Structures are given as C-alpha cells and as structure tokens.
Amino acid sequence: TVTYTARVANARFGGFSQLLLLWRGSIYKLLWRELLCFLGFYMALSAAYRFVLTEGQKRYFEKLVIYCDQYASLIPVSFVLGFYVTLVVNRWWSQYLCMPLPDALMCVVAGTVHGRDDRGRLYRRTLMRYAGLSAVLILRSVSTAVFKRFPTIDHVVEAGFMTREERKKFENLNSSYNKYWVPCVWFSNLAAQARREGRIRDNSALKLLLEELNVFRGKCGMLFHYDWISVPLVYTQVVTIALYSYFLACLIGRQFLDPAQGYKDHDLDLCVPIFTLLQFFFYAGWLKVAEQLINPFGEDDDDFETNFLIDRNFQVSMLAVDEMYDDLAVLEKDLYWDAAEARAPYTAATVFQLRQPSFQGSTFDITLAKEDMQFQ
Amino acid sequence: TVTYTARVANARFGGFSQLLLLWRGSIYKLLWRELLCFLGFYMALSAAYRFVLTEGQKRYFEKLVIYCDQYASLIPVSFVLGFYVTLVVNRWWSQYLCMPLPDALMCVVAGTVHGRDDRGRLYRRTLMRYAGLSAVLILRSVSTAVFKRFPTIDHVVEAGFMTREERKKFENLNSSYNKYWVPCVWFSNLAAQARREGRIRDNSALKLLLEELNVFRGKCGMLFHYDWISVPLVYTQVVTIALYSYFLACLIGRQFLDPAQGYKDHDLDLCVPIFTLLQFFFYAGWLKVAEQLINPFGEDDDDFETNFLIDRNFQVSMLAVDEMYDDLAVLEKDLYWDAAEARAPYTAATVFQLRQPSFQGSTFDITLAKEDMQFQ
Amino acid sequence: TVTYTARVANARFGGFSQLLLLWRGSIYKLLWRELLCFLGFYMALSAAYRFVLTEGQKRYFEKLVIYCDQYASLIPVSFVLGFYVTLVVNRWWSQYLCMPLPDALMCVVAGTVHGRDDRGRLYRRTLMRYAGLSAVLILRSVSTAVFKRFPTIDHVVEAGFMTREERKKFENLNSSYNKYWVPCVWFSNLAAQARREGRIRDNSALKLLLEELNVFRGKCGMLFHYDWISVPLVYTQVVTIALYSYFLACLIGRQFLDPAQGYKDHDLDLCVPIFTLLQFFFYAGWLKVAEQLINPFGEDDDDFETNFLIDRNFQVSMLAVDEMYDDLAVLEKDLYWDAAEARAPYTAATVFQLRQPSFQGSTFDITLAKEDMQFQ
Amino acid sequence: TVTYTARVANARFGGFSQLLLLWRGSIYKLLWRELLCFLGFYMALSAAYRFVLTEGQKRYFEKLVIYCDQYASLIPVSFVLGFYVTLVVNRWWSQYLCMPLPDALMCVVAGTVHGRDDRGRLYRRTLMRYAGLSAVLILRSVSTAVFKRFPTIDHVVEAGFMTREERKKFENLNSSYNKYWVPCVWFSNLAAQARREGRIRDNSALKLLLEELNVFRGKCGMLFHYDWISVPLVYTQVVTIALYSYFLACLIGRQFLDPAQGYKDHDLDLCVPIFTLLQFFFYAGWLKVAEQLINPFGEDDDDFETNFLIDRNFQVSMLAVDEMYDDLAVLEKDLYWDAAEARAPYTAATVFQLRQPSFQGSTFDITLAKEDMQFQ
Amino acid sequence: TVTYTARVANARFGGFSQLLLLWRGSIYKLLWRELLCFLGFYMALSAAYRFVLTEGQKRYFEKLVIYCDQYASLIPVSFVLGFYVTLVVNRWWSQYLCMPLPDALMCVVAGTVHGRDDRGRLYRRTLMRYAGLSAVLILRSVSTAVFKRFPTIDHVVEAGFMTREERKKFENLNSSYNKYWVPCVWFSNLAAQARREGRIRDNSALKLLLEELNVFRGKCGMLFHYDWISVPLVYTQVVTIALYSYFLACLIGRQFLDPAQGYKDHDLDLCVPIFTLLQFFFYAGWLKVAEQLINPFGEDDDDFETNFLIDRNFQVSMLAVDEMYDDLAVLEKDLYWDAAEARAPYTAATVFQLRQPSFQGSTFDITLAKEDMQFQ
Numbered sequence A, B, C, D, E: 001t002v003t004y005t006a007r008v009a010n011a012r013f014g015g016f017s018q019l020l021l022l023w024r025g026s027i028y029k030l031l032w033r034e035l036l037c038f039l040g041f042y043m044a045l046s047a048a049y050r051f052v053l054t055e056g057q058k059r060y061f062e063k064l065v066i067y068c069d070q071y072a073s074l075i076p077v078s079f080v081l082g083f084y085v086t087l088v089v090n091r092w093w094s095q096y097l098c099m100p101l102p103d104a105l106m107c108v109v110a111g112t113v114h115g116r117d118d119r120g121r122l123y124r125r126t127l128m129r130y131a132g133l134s135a136v137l138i139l140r141s142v143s144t145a146v147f148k149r150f151p152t153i154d155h156v157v158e159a160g161f162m163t164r165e166e167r168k169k170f171e172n173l174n175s176s177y178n179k180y181w182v183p184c185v186w187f188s189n190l191a192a193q194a195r196r197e198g199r200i201r202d203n204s205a206l207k208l209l210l211e212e213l214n215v216f217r218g219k220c221g222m223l224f225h226y227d228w229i230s231v232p233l234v235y236t237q238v239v240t241i242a243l244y245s246y247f248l249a250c251l252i253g254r255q256f257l258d259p260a261q262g263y264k265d266h267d268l269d270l271c272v273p274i275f276t277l278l279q280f281f282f283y284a285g286w287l288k289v290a291e292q293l294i295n296p297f298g299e300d301d302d303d304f305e306t307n308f309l310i311d312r313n314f315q316v317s318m319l320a321v322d323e324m325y326d327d328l329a330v331l332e333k334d335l336y337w338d339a340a341e342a343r344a345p346y347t348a349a350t351v352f353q354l355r356q357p358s359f360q361g362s363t364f365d366i367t368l369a370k371e372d373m374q375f376q
C-alpha cells in the first residue's frame, strides 16, 4: 500500500502537485509502457504521413484523420470509466474491509478463555492460531503474494500456523472444496471443549466467542466470494473496448496535418500532441486505477500488503492472548481522581486549539425575545 | 462465473487488453448476433443507396441521413445506461450476497449440538440438511439451472435433501405460497427439541442457532424477493428504447454518402463504419452487462454457479457437523510457544517484502521542535 | 409487481427487445396519454404553421423555432433525471425491504413459545396475529390498496386480524397518533406473560422474541416514515419543471420548417418528429419510472402487491406456529449417512455443469520455481 | 414535512404536473425572490442596452454579450449540482433516520420493567421520560424550532420532561460539553436499579434494555455529529460559486441583441428570456433543494417536524409503558382457529386483486422434456 | 470543523450567498495562492504576447492559443472530479463515523460495573481510561494535531491517560506493530476481573461490556486502516493531472487575442479572464474539497477537531462512570402522571406549529363509496 496520508494532512499550496512526484503506486509506473506504445503508434503514423505516403496518399490520410477526429467522443468514455472505476474502487475498499483480523477475537479470548497454566495458554494460543490459519488459507487462496510465501500446505506447517497433526486431520478431510473453513470448525469445537472444561466460565462468553468466530469466518468467506465472483468480464471488456476505441480515434484523428492544405482546425503543427498525450495519460490512468484495484491481493504497489498483515495479526494475537492475559497493572487512582473536571495538558504547538469556543449545538445563538419565550 | 481474478492480480502491460481475447462470459459471445443484425441493416441500407435507389431517391436518402445524424445523441444514452446498469450491477452483487450458505450455521451446530452417538450425528446432520433443503427449495424457485436439476420435489427427495416422510409432511401443508420457509420452521422446532433433550447444553447456544437460522432464512427470503420484485419493467423498457433509438439514428445517420455530392462531414467513404460498429459494440455491450446480470440465476456464463454452490454447501456442511465434530488434534504447543515475538518464514520469492518499513501511522515522521513538545 | 425475471434469465438474442412487447407495468401504459398530448400540441402547431399562419407570421414562427431549438439542452435534463430517479429507485427498494414480514418471528415463535394444548396454540397464534395486525394497520395507513380493503377498523375486525375485545382496547387508547405500534406493545406484553407462565422456557428465548419483535416494529415504523417523509417536493418540482422545459423547447424547436426557406439544419420535412417523439418517450418514461416508484404502495402495476403479502404472511405465519409446531418427521438417517463425500444427482439437462473445474482460488495456477518455494 | 405521498400513489396522467400547483414546500416559495432578483438584473441590463447605452456603447455591450454566452457552460454546473445535492439529500435522509424514537425502548420497557403498582409505573414512565428528555435536549441543541419551544432548561422542566430535582442534578454536573447524554446515563443507572430490585426479572432483559438505550443514545449523538460536522463549507462555496458563475454568464449572454445588427444566433427579440428564466428556475431550484435539506431541523416546510415528533414520542411512550402495561385482551381463539388455510375477506374495490396468479418463483413455467428430467 | 449549520437552518433569500462571505474553512483560504499563481502565469503570457513577442511571434502564439482552446475539455474534468471527490467525501464522513467515542461504553459501565467504594470507582474510571487511552494512541498515530499534543508516550503518561506502571507494561510488550489495541486487551482483562470479583453482577453484562469494547476497538482499528490505506495514489494523480491539463489548456487558450487579427470567437479583449478565473476557482475548489477532506485528521479548518473530542470524551466518560454512578434523583411522579394524554406546552414563537393536522398516513383521505367498502 502506498500510504501518502501524511503528505495530504493539510490542504497545502503544493497539495496534490507534490504527489505528482511520487513513483511507487504512481500513474507513471502503471502507464509509461502504454504511453510509449501510444506515442510509438502516433509517431509511426506521423513518420508515414510526413516521409512515406505520396501526395494522393497524404490527401487520403488527411480525409481519414478528419473523419476519425469526429469519433473521438470523450463523453461516453468518461461516463463508462466513471461508473466502472467507481464500482471497482468501492469493491476494492469492501475487499479490504473483508480481510479477516483477530482483534475482536483476541479481546474476547483474553477476556473469556481463562487459566494462567500451560493448558490455558494452549487453549488461547490455539484459538487464535486457528483464526490466523483460516486467514492464511483463504489468503494463499486469493493472494498471489501469500501463495508465493505458502506455495504448499507444508509451507504453512513449517511457518507454525498448522501443526503436523492438524495437517494430517486437514488432509484426511474428504472435501474437493477449499478448506479455509476447517480451522473455523476447529475453533468452534475447541471453544465448546473449553466451555465444557470450564476454561470459559459462562455460556454467554462461549456465545460471544462463537459470534466473533462467525464474523471472522464471514470475512474469510467474503474474501473467497470476491475472488471467485469477478467484476463481470463483459463489463470489463466493454470499458476496455470503449477506451481503446477512443484511443484509436485519437491515434488517427489527432495526427497533425500540413497547415499548407489549409484544413479547418488543422493550421498548427506541434509534431507532438501534448494535449492528446495528456488526455491519453488521464483516461488510461483512470482505467489503470481499475486495473490495479480489480484484484487488490496481487503484488502491485497499491495492492494490499497481505504478508505484513499475516505477520502482524499472528504476532499481535499471540501477544494479546499469551503475554497480556491477566497481566494488568494494579488498579491505582488516575491523575484526575480528585478533579471534578478532566483535561490533559496541551503542548505549545497545539495550545492555539484552546480558547476556540466549545461547540454545544447550532441553536445556542438564536437570542429570542422575552415574549416569544413564554409558554402558551 | 467467469473468474479472471488471477489474470488481473497485477496491473501488467497487457492488463485488460488480454481480457479482450476471452470468449466465455465475453462481450463477443453476448453481442455477436446483435452486431451482425446491426451490420446487416447497415449494409442493407448501404446496398439500397448504392445500387437500388435512383438519383432523386439517393438525394432524399442523403437528406434523411444528414437529418438522422443530428439525433444520434450519445450523451443521454450514456447517462441512462450508466445509471440503469449501475443499479443492475449493485442489485446483482446484492443478490450474490443474499444466497444462503451454511457456514455460520455449521460453525454453530458443530459447536453447540453435541453427541458422538448416532442421535447427535442425526441432529447435526438433520439441522444442516434442513438448511440445505431450504436453500435448494428457494434456488429451484429462483434459479433455472437448479430447476432443471430439480424439476420436481421427487427430484429433491431422490437427491437426499428431503426424506420421504419429510416430503409427506411438506405436501400435507395446506399452503398455496412457496414453502421454502418450511425447512426453517423444522430447523427451529428441531433446535428447540435438541435443547429440550440437552443436546444443546445451554439456552444461549439455542439462541445462537436460532439467530444464525434467522440469517439463513433471511437470505432465502431475500432471494425470493429479488426474484419477484424485478428491476421495474418501465425502467428497463426506457433504457432499451433509449439504446435502440440511438442505434436507429446511427443506423441511418452513419450511412456513408457519396463524396461526389460534397456534403459537409461526408467526404470519405470507408464502406464500413468501423467507429460506429465500435460505438454499437460499446453501448450494446454496456446494456448486455445489465441483460446478463438482471437475472443472475439463469444459465449464462457470468450467471451464478448455483448447482456448484448447492453441492459444495451440502458436502462441506455435512463434513463440518459429522466428520469434524469433536475431532480436534491434541492441544500441543505451537512453533512460537517460547518466542516473545512471532513471525513465519518468508520464501525467496516474497523475502523482498521484508525490510520495507512497518507502517505505524501517518504522524510518526513529524519531527517537532523541543520547545513545541512542552505542555502548557 | 410485474415480474419478468424468467424472461431475462439468460442474455438471449431477443433479450430486452421482447420486453418491449409487454403492456402491464410498461412504459406504453404509463406514457401513451402524455405521448398523445405531446403529439397533439406538436401537430396543433404544425397545422397552425402550415395552414393558419400568414407568410410574415410563418417567418416569425420559424425564427422562434430556430431560437427554441437552441434551448433544448438534453444534458441538464439527463443529469437531473439520472440523479432524481436513482434516488427514487433506491428509496423504492428500501421501502420494499422495510415492509414487515413475520418469517423471523415465526421461526422464533415456533422454536420458543411452547405447548401442544389449546393455550400454547392461542399464545403462538396470538403473537403472530399481533405481528400481522401491526403490519395491516401500518399498510392500511400507507397503502391505498389495503385501505380500500380495510376502510375501517371494523373491516380489520371482520377480517380476523383484530378481535372485538382487542378493538375495544385499541379504541379506548387516548392517542391522537397512528396506533400501528399498539399490537407490538401487546406482543411485548404477551411474550412477557408467556415467559412468566413458562411457555417460553428461557430468558434468552424471550430476549430473542423481543429482538425479532423490535425488528418487525422497526419495519412498520419505517413504512410510516417513508410515507410521511416524501422525496422533497422542491426536488420533484425541479425535475418536473426541467423535463417540461425541455419538452416545451422540443415542442417548438422540433417543428419542421419549409425546406423552401432554406434554413440550415431544416431542409427535410418528415411531418412527424420520429426522433423527437422517441426522445420524449425516453425522457418522459424515465420520469414515469420515478412517478410509478415514488409511492410504491399505490395500486399501479409495479406498485407492491401489499394485499397478496398480507394474505401470504397471515396464512404462512399461522401454519408455522400452529400446524407445524413440534411436528417433525422422525430423525432418520439421510441418503448420505455412510458416504464420506456428499453429492446429489444431476439431471441430463444440467449434467454439463459437471466436469467444469471446481473453483479453489485465483492463486492455484501460479506454478512457481523450486528455488523460489524455499523459506529464507 | 410537506407530505404528497397520497397525490403520487398511482402514476396518473396529471402525475407530477399537479405537484407543480403546490405552494408549501415548493420551488416557487423557495425561489421567487431569487427569480425576481435575476429578472431585475436582466431587465436592468435590458433597459440599459435599449434606452441608456449609446451606439458605440451598444456595440461594445453586444460584443460582451456574445463573449459571455460562450462561458454559460451548463454541463459543469449540472455535474457539481448533481453530486453535491445527491450528497445533501442522502445526508438529509440519514439525519431523519438518526432522530431518536422510543418505539424499541417502549416495547422492551413494557415487556421487561414490571409491576402494576405505583413504583412499577414510576420506573417505566421514568425510563421513557429519560429517553424523551435525552431526545429533547439533543433536539433543542440541533433544532431551531425546538430551541424556540425550549429556550431554557426551565422550559424543559415546565414541560414535564425534567423534574426540579433532576434539573438540580443536571446543572450540578461540572461539564462544559453538551449534556444530552446525561438522561441516558440516568437510564442506564435506573435500569440497573430496577434489575437489582427485581423489577426487571432477568439479566438478559436488562441487557436488552441497555442495547436499546445504546441505540437511542447513538441516534441522539448522531444528531449532534450531523449538526456539528456540516457538509464542508469549501464544497458548498464551490457549488454556490459554480451556480452564480453560470447565472452571471446567463445574465449577460442571454441578453437579447438587436436583430438589426444581424448577429448570428441573435435574430429574434422576445424581450423576456422564457427559456433562460426556466433554466434559472431549474438550476436555482436544484440548489434550493440542498439549501432546504442542508439543515433539516430548521423551520422550513420540508424541514423535519421535530416538535410534532417530540409530542408524539412522549404521548405514545407514556401510553405504551403506563396504560398498556399488562393490559391484554383475554387470549381467545381468532377467526381462523379451525381453518387449515387463512385469508381475510376482500372488498368489492380490491376483489379484482384476487384471481391474479399467486407468485411462486421465476422457474415454475420452464416445462422441461421427460428425458431431461432424469437424473444421471 | 467550520460549523455553519445555524446559518442554513432555513432556506433564506441570502441562503448560500452569505456563506460566500466566510473565510475560515473557505474556498478563498484554500485556493487564493493557486488563484494568484494561475493569474500570474496568465498575465505573464499576456504581457509576453502584448509587449515582448514580435509580429510573427504574436501570430504563432495566436495559432497556439486557438489550438489550445480546443483541448479545454471541461466535461472529462467535471466527470473525474465528480467521481473522485464523491469518493473522498464519502470516505471523509466514514472516517468521522469511525472515530471512537466512549458513549456506549459509559452507559454500559455506569449500568454494569458496580460499587460506591473506591474500588468500584477505580474499576469504572480505569475501564473508560483504557478506552480513552486506546483512542488517544490511535489518534496520535493518525492525527497530526494529536501527535503535536502527544509527541511521546511520556506526554500521554503526563496527560493522565496512561499510568507509569501501565507505561512499563506497554513498553515491555515485544511488538513492532502499533499498540493502540493494548488498552483494549487491558479492558477485556479488567472487565473479566470485575466479573470474577462480582463487580459485574451478571455474565450478560460482561458480554455487553465486551460487545461495546469490540465496537470501540473496531472504530480505533478502522481509523488505523483509513490512515494506512490511502485513496489510491494512481487515482489521485489521475485527477490532479486531469485538472492541471485543463488549466494548462485554459492558461494558453483563454489568452485574449487582438481583435485586430479578426479571429473568430476572439473579438473582445477584457485583459482579465473573469469567467476563466471563475472556472479555475470552481474546478480548483472542487479538487480542494478532496485535498482538505483526503486526510481529515490534519490541522486544517474542516479537518476534525480531534483534540476537542479527546478532551470531551475523557471528561464526559469520567463524569458518567464516577460522579453520575448510582446518583439518581428519587423516582417521583412526572407532570403527566394523572393525564391520559401527554403534551408539553408550546411557546408563543412555535404555537403556530399547533393546529396543523397531525399526520396519520397517506390513505386517510380516500373517501371510498359505501358499495366498495363491503367485503366479498
């Protein structure tokens, strides 16, 4: 993920202009090959027209160029790009939100699956490892970068996500369908066993674990569904064909004609279509947004960092349920125990934020008349 | 479902261009008949104008062609297609998400409906079979492909989803309305019976089953509502009439006139309207996206694979509640038991992802001054 | 509801074209009067110009027609129609989803309110009748078709939804506000009484009933809010005025002038504006979509079938809680008891769906090198 | 709220046209001053050009008018209005849905907080009064109309929402932030006290009360957030400046020039720009939709009726928890006790809805062949 | 946050016009530098053309200006701005809703974590301080203004959010990932300890605390995800390049040419492009909306007031759980105890709202015939 949230904290003078000097995740990186190809075809026809074609041939070419410039309908392309890329971006953010995290589960497991002894550690660590394992299986199913990390189940077993015994159980399942759900059913069964052994002290806590498991499993399944159910291929081919039709019309119709011939609208020869190359860069970048975001679990630059999230989720979950279980600092009175009001100090940098009026509501400046304040 | 998620993992040079060489689920497959019809009418008028019509008749035709080219308003068509097809695509994804799956139920039933004996197997397998049966009834109601698979309730009984006794109970219901809800009320009653027999060990687990059943039943009902409440037929007729009005204006106005007559904008005769055929292909494909997605449970190529999902859901649910019930590998210490930090190994392919700075937040590079860090 | 989901299962050659031959729910039915009025004004001005107006008068008219054709800005109308009708369609689908159904409640009541005796039947049937009665009161408040069915509370009492005693209690409430919520408070009280008498066996089941009641009551209230809070009348008047301004500009500017006068763009006289009538039909149909969907509980053809839903909901709910309570077929082993895998047979029609590769994930065809598979 | 849901039940011939004859909540009411101002500037320049400016001055003015007509870009204005007003309308409906209602709470309190005696009445009535008081405090914070009704906390105390003792407790809180949340914490504490005294008979019912309280409090807080976090002022200034730029270009460029001068496109002098005034009325009404809906808690005509909702919510909640507590009609057999099927009678007006085929699903008309029905 | 909700309560004559006179949060403040730069380049080329360029050079420049005016395609820019800025505004409101507040937690903790003694105060105050501390850690991670307030964890410790002991525990965690989740796991553990000590009186109340904690923690994590997963940098660069391409075409093509040369469309020389500067101001302000809203936790004027929310949330939460715990005014009969109906008095200002008909539903004015009211 190319994060530039810091560069755009404040609407500054440079603002988005400075973002034009970034290379990773950029439009330049995604589009320079297509821009050179577009420019190569344009200068190939330019060289043909200037040096190769004869006078009759040049006249015919100019008639074709005037004809093709008519069909460079940028409004249809802008419409269909707008709608398609809006769909793809929304789907992209939905896919990011559908990635499983153990955060709700780790809060619930640290709060509900009890025991300072090795068994309690085993239960808590095993419940999160199941959650992490379900996440890893679905990600290696849907992510190229996680597949290259875990090309085999042996790789998942060596990485500590799955034990050898769990690998035997997992392979011995006679299922021809993706088994990402298997750790989730193991999690259900183990949470039931924990509640039967009294490690979960109450039936509502078991219900809370199973609710949070169901949310987690839902996210893993949603990843699977987004992977399988692509943005319809007809819809994609339609937008690609739209853009390419526009660029063929721009590749022929934006050819600079001889000012000698005195064609209307063709009286200046810049030899390079600056504005047509910028339109190409704009529209092709707009489609490259969809191209990058259509499968966000590839290995792009704005593609999701699925291997970083796997490592973070594992380490954090294990901290939360093993090192931070029942490891509270002693309840001691906070700084504002004796103070009726409560306000942390402000730094010299942000002290200016003080003395700005505290918002109470829009209606607290009306200043009615005395007569209008009396009830009926 | 034509899944091309792998082909678009990374925004590559080929990118969407290579997707133009796919046939299944493609714009070519959905639109070649309409393209040949469009082209047939265009060349029928072309042949009429070139060989059949007389000189007066040819002049009149050219006046009509110039008149019709005025009315080829592509911006209204792009607007209404954009809005209608956006509606249809959103509805299509909603319908996919409203398809019932037993995944939440199987986690809950493996976790809550207990017993290693044949009765416990019966209860768990029967609860999921009820869920699968409710799904099959609604799908054969809404899916053409599942109806051809299950043309009669006898077919559902032979497929193992409904017993003969359950068929007698199901037919003996005096209801003239679709009975997809019947297995869900059977599921409610059986979960109640399981909780009364103590197979469900706690009242919260029964509540969890009924919550998950209600979600499942909601999905089945939602499938029914999407099937019944079509995208309004007036709205569809409006977009079809829009597109056909544009194509009639393009079918007459894009006719190539004699350059001899010296009509403005008509001075080149290509004999085939490359750009008009591409516009037709673009706009008709855009409407074909809605046509394919308007009922996603047909038997298209991007239509949902409802028979695959039926088979997967059945097999997986039965595995989850029968073979994987209380079948945990023994709790043993994972690979990272003694390690304070936790990190799976990375392959040579994805080791490059390492040594990239771990994201902490946008604000961790501000580097304030010493004086501005002091509290007031 | 005009359901055409079957006609559009597959993207066929005819496809949406055949939908142009439907009359119910159609654009023709909704728009033929307005089309004849538009055409009547157009031919009234045509007859005035051709036979009534003098030569000076004809010249002035032609100057006015050329002036008015300038103002036929179809892009603003397409924008505002797009946005307004998108709002109205989204609101329409939201209103359909906000119609109350007893399906969650009937699953919960069959599962939670117990007793084979007449009292248990009374409790279950009375809880659903309360839910159905709340639905009927709000629908007769918001639906014209249900109001014509239930013009008085006496009509609701005769229909079996409300008893005479319940009518006395319902009228004796000193409330000047719509009392659709009254059965919901009766449902709350009766569920409490059932739980006190032990008919609901656990406090979590009572909580489940009250949760499902709250969802039901929320839907009824949402119907009330959608009825009361119309799409803002300023926004509607704006789109109606937009469309009518465009049609006045098209009614004057699309008048066919004498080719004799040799006006530019006016050199052919078709005597009937085919393309202008199609634009009128397109844009007026687009607004007629909003007109039909703005109050979906009227008595149109795409308006919701609220009387069918009332009858279905009542019959089904009563079946679910009375005839199907504790009426399970005996738990017997299903067809796939002894089979490790589970797969229903496929028909000759849909056997082709088999032998298509089972989807596992996008990443299962990468085929890495041996060296890149090794961990660091 | 100007409710016209009845007038638009059916898509009638008059339809939206008759809505153009409404004054309250109308575009006329919101825009006649701006229309007269626009028209006053237009006729001021018209009078200047016709009677005041000299021949040279008139020529210069006409050059300026032709120049300004070029810049009347209606497509950008339509784009930005569309997007901004769509944002404002969505926000408006969200704000309406975020208004607190006690309906879920009253169902839960009538069902959970028990006692026929004065103490039970006190507890139920006090819990709803707290909810109503939280609603009144946030509304007087965000609503102008409720602020004019409750200009002081003394006004809330006189209205019966807050007792004098509760006023002392409420003022004695050392908080400089809006205290709308205070009754919600009182509600939490009182529900806890009720559950401790056994007035709430079970811990799940207390959980249900607190869940419903949290939803209520969330709605009150959401009202506060929508009040505080305005639609960004830069975004508003952008759309206002867009519209005013268009209207300045239309105010100069739509000036009728002398047909004598023989300017192209300026050959008819209507002395009043009918179509330009309609465009002004259309676009300014479109922005007036946002202007009316941007703060829906003002005192407009489409602004929310917050004082009606306060009175309804109070009266209804008090009925629900005080007069209708444990006040059921005796469980007696309904009209359809002995009938296997269940169907209320239909009136002569709506009997036509009968005999229309009952919808079962799209797939129930396929009519397969005998050979295709056989399983593999 | 620049709140102008009061200024736009009613759609007044001034309305949005008066909002053009605001400076904070305004388009003027965000855009005057860019406007002066645009104007500086425009007048630099104007001075070059008028005084510096020779006659041949002036002719060439005018040919370039006519060429560049062709490429000033405002419709593509309006499309892509519309879609991108709509995305950014929606994301901005989502980010505001994803900011954590303790309001649900404070209601639940005041209602569930009991004890008037110092230990109960410690538990309640410590649970909210954990919630506030989790909020402060994530905000200092994502907010520049909170980072300048809390540049170090020492600053958080001095502000009273974290104790020294909690700081030792927090630093001793071997995690390389952002530790905003740490107080949430402390909250889970402490709520478990409270429930074990009997301070939480029931298991459902513990479940309610953990549910509300999970919502809170979800909001904190969502803040982290929005911070990390920027709006794709390719999409931003595309819109910035679009706007800058349009402004370069407007910077050259909107240059005023000599009326002497008699170029079409260039016959008036205003020396300052009023309308082009307004278009620049409109489009650049439209992009400045995204620029301001793209990271709403900066230190702008419409950026969120994160330091005010930190102070409010802390003070209010501590009031709610410490000063207002079990501090109810004595249950006494409200003003409407003996009144069957319930209605607060109305002021002279808002008494006009009375006598307006109380809304009952759209269907209560149909006035059917006697014969049509009879059941079949």
Ligand SMILES: N[C@@H](CCC(=O)O)C(=O)O
Pocket: A001, A002, A143, A144, A145, A146, A296, A297, A298, A299, A300, A301, A302, A303, A304, A305, A306, A307, B353
């Ligand atoms: N390995 C990452 C690459 C993404 C990036 O570099 O931002 C993935 O799975 O997508």
Ligand SMILES: N[C@@H](CCC(=O)O)C(=O)O
Pocket: B001, B002, B143, B144, B145, B146, B296, B297, B298, B299, B300, B301, B302, B303, B304, B305, B306, B307, C353
């Ligand atoms: N039988 C599948 C066909 C879909 C496909 O082939 O993708 C269905 O029900 O839609």
Ligand SMILES: N[C@@H](CCC(=O)O)C(=O)O
Pocket: C001, C002, C143, C144, C145, C146, C296, C297, C298, C299, C300, C301, C302, C303, C304, C305, C306, C307, D353
């Ligand atoms: N009586 C139905 C009519 C709808 C229809 O015929 O589809 C209603 O209430 O809307």
Ligand SMILES: N[C@@H](CCC(=O)O)C(=O)O
Pocket: D001, D002, D143, D144, D145, D146, D296, D297, D298, D299, D300, D301, D302, D303, D304, D305, D306, D307, E353
């Ligand atoms: N007093 C109402 C006025 C709204 C109306 O009249 O519709 C309010 O608070 O907005």
Ligand SMILES: N[C@@H](CCC(=O)O)C(=O)O
Pocket: A353, E001, E002, E143, E144, E145, E146, E296, E297, E298, E299, E300, E301, E302, E303, E304, E305, E306, E307
């Ligand atoms: N300090 C505030 C500044 C916002 C404002 O001034 O409105 C922040 O964190 O964004």
Ligand SMILES: [Ca+2]
Pocket: A291, A292, A293, A294, A295, A296, A297, A298, A299, A300, A303, B008, B009, B010, B011
């Ligand atoms: Ca990608």
Ligand SMILES: [Ca+2]
Pocket: B291, B292, B293, B294, B295, B296, B297, B298, B299, B300, B303, C008, C009, C010, C011
């Ligand atoms: Ca289809």
Ligand SMILES: [Ca+2]
Pocket: C291, C292, C293, C294, C295, C296, C297, C298, C299, C300, C303, D008, D009, D010, D011
């Ligand atoms: Ca209607």
Ligand SMILES: [Ca+2]
Pocket: D291, D292, D293, D294, D295, D296, D297, D298, D299, D300, D303, E008, E009, E010, E011
């Ligand atoms: Ca308002």
Ligand SMILES: [Ca+2]
Pocket: A008, A009, A010, A011, E291, E292, E293, E294, E295, E296, E297, E298, E299, E300, E303
């Ligand atoms: Ca910002």
Ligand SMILES: [Cl-]
Pocket: B204, C204, D204
């Ligand atoms: Cl619960």
